[PDB]
Design a protein around this nucleic acid. Structure first.
Lengths: 141, 117, 103, 109, 53
RNA sequence: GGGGAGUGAAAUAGACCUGAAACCGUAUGCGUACAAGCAGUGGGAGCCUACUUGUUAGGUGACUGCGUACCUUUUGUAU
RNA sequence: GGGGCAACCACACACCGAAGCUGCGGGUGUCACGUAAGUGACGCGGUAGAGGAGCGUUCUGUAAGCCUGUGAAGGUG
């Protein structure tokens, strides 16, 4: 019968991404492919096999056309009349690391695996990460 | 000849409550609920004999696809590569050779590239 | 030593010794069977694949037993329409054993 | 081990589960001290049973009153006596009056 | 108002999980070796080693 | 009301043959305190107890895909 | 439908995709065969409704038989 992966025998790696002019949703579709594990031959859906990602410049990211002065990010507070909105340009000066997380979070399953695949994503707005001990390799510059 | 039906009714009740054990709460112990959960759990077991064949075929394909990109193709150009030639191999035993016998898989992939498709 | 033989409309991953269950075929118990429908033969690392069938290679197997594995149930029910129908099924099989591979 | 019962005891089952869970798995020295000072109705009855289980160990089966640790306390349900009580606008409704079976089982291991 | 469905064995037993007991005030008399409640007169009528009744 | 002891072929035949289901408990194993729904089904990790010791079998089911009870009336009901 | 940018026109190959078709294994109705099943020889979603074939319960015949205190009927695995 066909082989399934085992969670105590899984091997995981450390990648680092530079986002310095990458288009937002074309960058983010290749992170979310490699967090789920479609690049490995031993992929089963019910276990998590995938590589930790570190993203280093989450403020250099680029969007196309007139979308910088548009693209409201709506969310509701719970109270009556509590709808709130903030566009792309004003958001990126407030918290730059939450643009690129909410784009990847919507390209994942909504399971308790999706919450577990989302913990392998680690973004930074700086230029260096506190993970030199794990020694991530570069991919796809 | 009065017949009293108290003994052949009981055998047909215990035959239901044997198939319906392991269930939650009142579906495994009282009969007017455990008859519904035996019929419903037989319809699901009829549909899912067909859906078993679809959940593995979609699992074999996504394992060939991952293994054949690492050598330098897609999935869809590989299948046209093997059927330019005549290799005649299922999805079930390609996705065995993708995981376990990885060197024999690479000797297959190079022959699809030589088939140039 | 692993071959790909094709028994009953489906192929297998046989590596010798093989208590292996096949659909039912017409032979008695204790007779030797030759499979001439082998698709790739590997040995150590030396692996060759058949343009459709690889030449010369045989797999020798013999029948351990016959049996009939399962009891699966069928319920054809329609709600609200006064219709329900049941049926059992047990499928034959044939357990063989490979004493085989011939490159 | 030796046992004791009180089959037929007027307090209901569920009210007397709350005194059985307090003492299950202790020693009988401090089990008599939890029951001398508890304020509930079941506690005066369970101490009458717990010292009946002990006095069957100083008697018939040998054992000292020190090494006994109370092993298995359970309280089952018994017969219920059914009575009527009138309510308003002619309608009368029915009352039960419950009892229980208590079983305290001490063990000299 | 009345209920609309009955409560299972789980949701009935979860309710009464907060309803346990306690008795912890026991203390030994220093003189007579008698057990009583802390800050109470002992049943032989001794409070902190003195006969009162 | 019990615990012995005695009668009896047998007191879990003790003031009563057998003694089921719903209902209520007590022990032992395995799973559950960041996770959304007819509570099952398809795949499935681990753990447990047995057997030759693992497909020899049994019990639990993390995780995950599909899944809006039964009857009656009706042009149609998850309704 | 959502993330997001994989949108429109002409066009080419490739793949994916049902309980459809094919492969292998069983079953059955019908008609013939190769004796109408020795064997062939061709079909099977279904309500109201029409036709065909069976299981079990209690009592009577066979029963002055046969089984049972080495253990019946029951209850439980």
């Amino acid at each position: 019968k066909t082989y399934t992966a085992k969670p105590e025998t899984v091997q995981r790696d450390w990648f680092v991404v530079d986002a310095a002019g990458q288009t937002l949703g074309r960058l983010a579709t290749e992170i979310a492919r490699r967090l789920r594990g479609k690049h490995k031959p031993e992929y089963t859906p019910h276990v998590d096999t995938g590589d930790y990602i570190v993203v280093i410049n989450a403020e250099q990211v680029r969007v196309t056309g007139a979308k910088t002065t548009d693209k409201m990010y709506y969310h509701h507070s719970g109270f009556p009349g509590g709808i709130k909105s903030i566009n792309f340009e004003k958001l990126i000066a407030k918290a730059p690391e939450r643009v690129i997380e909410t784009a990847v979070k919507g390209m994942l399953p909504k399971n308790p695996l999706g919450r577990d695949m989302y913990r392998k994503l680690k973004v930074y707005k700086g230029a260096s990460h506190p993970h030199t001990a794990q020694q991530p390799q570069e991919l796809k510059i | 000849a009065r017949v009293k039906r108290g003994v052949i009714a009981r055998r047909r009740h215990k035959k239901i409550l044997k198939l319906a054990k392991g269930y939650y709460g009142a579906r495994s112990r009282v009969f007017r609920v455990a008859k519904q959960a035996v019929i419903k759990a037989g319809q699901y077991a009829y549909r899912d004999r067909r859906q078993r064949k679809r959940q593995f075929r979609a699992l074999w394909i996504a394992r060939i696809n991952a293994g054949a990109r690492q050598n330098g193709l897609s999935y869809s150009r590989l299948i046209a590569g093997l059927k330019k030639a005549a290799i005649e191999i299922d999805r079930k035993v390609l996705a065995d050779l993708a995981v376990n016998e990885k060197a024999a898989f690479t000797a297959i992939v190079e022959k699809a590239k030589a088939s140039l498709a | 030593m692993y071959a790909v033989i094709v028994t009953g409309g489906k192929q297998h991953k046989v590596t010798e010794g093989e208590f292996l269950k096949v659909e039912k075929l017409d032979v008695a118990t204790g007779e030797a069977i030759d499979f001439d429908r082998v698709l790739l033969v590997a040995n150590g690392e030396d692996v060759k694949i058949g343009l459709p069938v690889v030449e010369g290679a045989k797999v020798t197997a013999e029948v351990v037993s016959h049996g009939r594995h399962d009891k699966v149930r069928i319920i054809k029910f329609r709600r609200r329409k006064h219709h329900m129908k049941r049926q059992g099924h047990r499928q034959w099989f044939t357990e063989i054993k490979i004493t085989g591979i011939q490159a | 081990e030796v046992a004791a019962k009180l089959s037929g005891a007027r307090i209901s089952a569920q009210k007397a589960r709350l005194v059985a869970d307090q003492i299950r798995g202790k020693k009988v020295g401090e089990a008599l001290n939890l029951l001398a000072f508890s304020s509930k109705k079941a506690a005066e009855i369970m101490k009458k049973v717990l010292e009946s289980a002990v006095a069957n160990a100083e008697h018939n089966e040998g054992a000292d009153v020190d090494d006994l640790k109370v092993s298995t306390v359970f309280v089952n349900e018994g017969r219920s006596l059914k009575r009527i009580m009138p309510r308003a606008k002619g309608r009368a409704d029915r009352i039960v009056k419950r009892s229980c079976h208590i079983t305290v089982k001490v063990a000299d291991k | 108002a009345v209920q609309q469905n009955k409560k299972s064995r789980s949701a009935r037993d979860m309710r009464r999980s907060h309803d346990a007991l306690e008795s912890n005030a026991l203390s030994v008399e220093k003189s007579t070796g008698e057990v009583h409640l802390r800050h109470h007169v002992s049943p032989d009528g001794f409070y902190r080693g003195r006969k009162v009744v």
